[PDB]
Amino acid sequence: GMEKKSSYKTVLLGESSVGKSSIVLRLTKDTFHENTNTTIGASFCTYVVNLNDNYNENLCNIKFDIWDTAGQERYASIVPLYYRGATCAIVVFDISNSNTLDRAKTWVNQLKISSNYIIILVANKIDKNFQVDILEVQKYAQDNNLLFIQTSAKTGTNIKNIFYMLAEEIYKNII
């Protein structure tokens, strides 16, 4: 790779409650819900980043096809359907719950073996007052050659930037 595509399959992965549905809602509808429900059925959405909005107009309109595992990450025989053929993996944890970091690390290791993914590790819920050490997390991401970003779905902080960073990386690769 990288072959240029009409859209880029992107797995949105993380333990329940870390804020995946909230990242999608904030991203796509500029809205946040303090209370959320369990997902009914498969969870998909699309999002377009145009990098010029120095980039080649043909390559730099990047469309994400986001698959939110939304609970299916529990099932070892179902989750590969989310990974297969994905260009990007967004692995989310909650800064206030260290257990969710531990699971994210396990997923990063699985993904690195599975295929070549552009992986972004997302520290969500930074608006809250930390069970993790961010510096350790940043070091972790460097050691594993991951993109890293700190976000709040609640305030909107760095939500679009998740996909800006991914799109920059896809372009760099296509180029």
CB of 156 to its own copies, least distance (A): 28
Judged by CB under 8 A, which of 35, 37, 38, 40 binds its own copies? 40
Q: Is 7 in the site for Cl ion (CB under 5 A)?
A: no
Q: Which residue is nearest to ligand GDP (CB)?
A: 19
Q: Is 41 in the site for its own copies (CB under 8 A)?
A: yes
Structure tokens at 85: 């053929």
- DSSP run (H or E) holding 26: helix 20-29
154 is known to lie in a ligand binding site: yes
Q: Is 14 in the site for ligand GDP (CB under 6 A)?
A: yes
CB of 78 to its own copies, least distance (A): 7
| Residues in Cβ contact with 23 at an 8 Å cutoff, skipping those fewer than 6 apart | 12, 90, 92, 122, 124, 151, 153, 159, 162
Residues 10 and 88 sit within 8 Å (Cβ to Cβ): yes
| Residues in Cβ contact with 141 at an 8 Å cutoff, skipping those fewer than 6 apart | 121, 147, 148
Question: Which residue, 7 or 97, has its beta carbon nearer to its own copies?
Answer: 7
Q: Is 48 in the site for its own copies (CB under 8 A)?
A: no
Structure tokens at 106: 């396990």
Q: What does the alpha-carbon distance between residue 69 and residue 142 come to, in Å, rounded to a whole number? A: 25
Interface with Cl ion (CB under 5 A): 36-37
Interface with its own copies (CB under 8 A): 3, 5-7, 9, 40-42, 44, 65, 67, 76-78, 80-82, 84-85
